[PDB]
Amino acid sequence: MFYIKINEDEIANDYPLPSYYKTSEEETDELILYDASYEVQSEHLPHRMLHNWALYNSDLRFISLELLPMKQCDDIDVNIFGSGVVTDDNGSWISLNDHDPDGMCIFLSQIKEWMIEFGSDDIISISIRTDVAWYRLGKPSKLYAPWWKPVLKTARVGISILTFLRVESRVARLSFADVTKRLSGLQANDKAYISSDPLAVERYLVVHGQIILQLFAVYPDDNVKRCPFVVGLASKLEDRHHTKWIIKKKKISLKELNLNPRAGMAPVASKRKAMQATTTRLVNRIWGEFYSNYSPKREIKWDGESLGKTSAGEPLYQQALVGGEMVAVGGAVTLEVDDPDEMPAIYFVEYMFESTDHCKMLHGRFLQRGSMTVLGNAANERELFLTNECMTTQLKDIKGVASFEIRSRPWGHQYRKKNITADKLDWARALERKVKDLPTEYYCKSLYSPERGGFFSLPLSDIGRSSGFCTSCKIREDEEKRSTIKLNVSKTGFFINGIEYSVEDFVYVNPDSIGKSGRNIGLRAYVVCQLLEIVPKGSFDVKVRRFYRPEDVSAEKAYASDIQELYFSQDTVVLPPGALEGKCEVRKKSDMPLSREYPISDHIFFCDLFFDTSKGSLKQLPANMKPKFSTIKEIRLATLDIFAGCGGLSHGLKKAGVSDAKWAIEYEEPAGQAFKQNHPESTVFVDNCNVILRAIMEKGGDQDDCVSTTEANELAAKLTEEQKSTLPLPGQVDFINGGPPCQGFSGMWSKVQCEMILAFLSFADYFRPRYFLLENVRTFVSFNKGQTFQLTLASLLEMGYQVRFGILEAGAYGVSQSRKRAFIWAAAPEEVLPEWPEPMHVFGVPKLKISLSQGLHYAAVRSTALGAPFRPITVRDTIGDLPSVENGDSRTNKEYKEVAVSWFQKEIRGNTIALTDHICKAMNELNLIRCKLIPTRPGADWHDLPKRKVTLSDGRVEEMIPFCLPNTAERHNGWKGLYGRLDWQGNFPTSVTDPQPMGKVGMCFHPEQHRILTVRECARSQGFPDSYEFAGNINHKHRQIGNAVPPPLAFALGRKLKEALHLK
Ligand SMILES: Nc1ncnc2c1ncn2[C@@H]1O[C@H](CSCC[C@H](N)C(=O)O)[C@@H](O)[C@H]1O
């Protein structure tokens, strides 16, 4: 007879989304523990048991027991294997109404059968077979349990049908339709609940029909083998998706070696246990207090003489008495808010005067509570911040005078002990006043600027002047004067947004004002136009003549041409003044500057050709005339890099001229060798930062400020005398940068104590550098309900830093990858906090925002999707000149065969003749066939693979279409991008970070070659020059490239620090 198997599409609606198998321990193979298997009846084979088992196909995907025969077949087209811990046949059974000394850990051969035996009701047992023995099953692994539960549900349904076919007795009474009816009426709590719809019920029964069919053969009674239901289910079933195998009785024997996918595969590395971070006691206090609290008629007179006069002729005073209390300039007062439930508001006195008629009036600046800023619940109860907002009220509206001081404290590592003692004294005084219940004393140290996204230092000479003159009032008046169109003089020019436009200037015009990996396609850059005159239409319009870019002729001419080139024309437009975005410069080609930077950073173009729009021909500029091509012409800081990697941030910060990476701490051997290969004068420590900070504190005598574990103490005592003398002591470090792998969970505090952000912050606390830079993923601002970000800010503010936060997009600075990163800048009180770099490339990103509290947001830079100074950068611009390689090419040193054509390929190569690391990961045979059968078009993925059966060189028959996740219902979106190919005219996705060759491939194939992206190609999509060197095996090199901050973005950030270092 023929055995009908129901294909995976019919049974997929019940099983979870596909997932794959991983292990860390070595496994013996099955075939060596047993002798050779000659012709033997399947009755007489070893009987054993398995614990912590799983089942998987040749791609390592989790698979069901319903895809194996219930009986003995001859040929099987499905290759199923497994894992298990071998033990002895003891006799365990599973109870439906509801030990591992590692006998040995094995990986199994081709599974060819399974079986269910019926004990008592609610007690069954399940056994499986390979060609050497019989194996009985026990408790499954945690991750394969979701593929175990649907089998027992069908067991319950079958038991129920037996019960109410015999309970009703007259076994030959119920019919398929009758059973569907009685099943359908069950309540939604019984364990045999299929569905309340007849059609869904019959679907379930027919789809899972072989389990019921065997359970209706091993249930002891000669009353259920001829039932109408039994023969109905078998006569049905055919009208579903099915495969037809042959049932024959045979006599077993091995023929093949173990074709398990795990044969010859190394186990993956461990998940190294987190150890408690080495912190200082200040950081420990800050982070531990939070996690132990949280988530675990009256007279008035002027006092004294007059000081001067405001610029209206009105007297100006300094000290006033509000009924017994004293109010002074520099103090603070509390005003009674409308609703008598919230706390009062506190105002900083700027000046007080007597109005024209007669009044007692003051002008105040708003002092805000740290509870209502981005800090929130992490802020001190006594810390107030200064804002830009002002207020004028009468001196009768006060509730009372607050107690307030401005805290100016000295800076340096040399002062950090005296500070700690003074802080503890103040904390004790605060507790004493709270218990006796006296008033609160407040202090201010910083300035809150929600529109600049940071805490800045106090302008101490600007505040509290008592001269009738307020700085914030000037700033607001200027900001409202800035928003008017001001045609200068009678004519010839104007003012918009603070930019003066004159006649014969070159301007930027918005592209629309003049007329998948694909997101910049259809996105255009500014239109470069020349201003001719001013037309009446006082509100005016402007007359402009335009420039055509290489983009506007064809795509190939844009590939060939420099990115700062423009084509002349004779086209004129009349425009409204509000379409004008900025000013640029256009020179002749010979007048262009000699210095070339990869991030271009300046607004300069050149012209040499003509574009006749009527015929579409490029020709030399008409000698007839020329369009007046106007525009006629030590600070380096000693650096410590923590969590270094291969050096993406240090390369960009050393190129710009601010860093000299003298010390570095990377605990992995491959990344440390890669770092030392490229920065040969740097001292590299391949050690955990928890042991390095312990050694540094031990070298200064400060072993009592250290919170450390004893094993780290022993590791710090196991250092060579040579290594100890090359350590950074506090005093010699002026700049600290780092990429800590901060995480997200909840804690238990016990589970938060093991986080690497605490050790980084302790490095900042011990060394106290001039500048501090933190980089991390964009999700950092939303980990743990925003608590890690809030606590990081509060920790940096307890020391005395200025802090600034922002999210930046790398594609707007010159790369083909869309990497979003979060940056925190910290500077001493007496420095200048670096600005943010200007994005000059067009990218399709919607303006990344950080949520300040109380309904406000902040965004650091602009969005360039509607127009930017330069043209986007494509895949052909990045990898178009590299030679052709094949699957699994290991040759590290090759040669260049073509020359550069595009601007990017002339920046990246330079004067390099040796092509290193143009190697790719090897795909096995079945994945290679699928990669060769994918079309070379934009947006081609696994939906393009024909449904077919592939025969390999082993004799294995496999399936062309990989993961099966439709489950024909929502909970998936088609899984677009898996087994995907890139687009020549698009950009690199952020899924080529560590391409995987086996299970869930992703979008990593070459646009025309049948292979995965090479290491060199992934290095060029982040801006790494062709001379940069990597180290390790291929996996470590891909990891080193994936973790890095792009060197172009790091150059732009470091060039803004070099401007801040000149302004001091
Ligand atoms: N406890 C620890 N001590 C030192 N290094 C660690 C560490 N835990 C992780 N690391 C290393 O720190 C690095 C964090 S990635 C930092 C990336 C770096 N910005 C760059 O520019 O390339 C990883 O390479 C990791 O290997």
Ligand SMILES: [Zn+2]
């Ligand atoms: Zn003011």
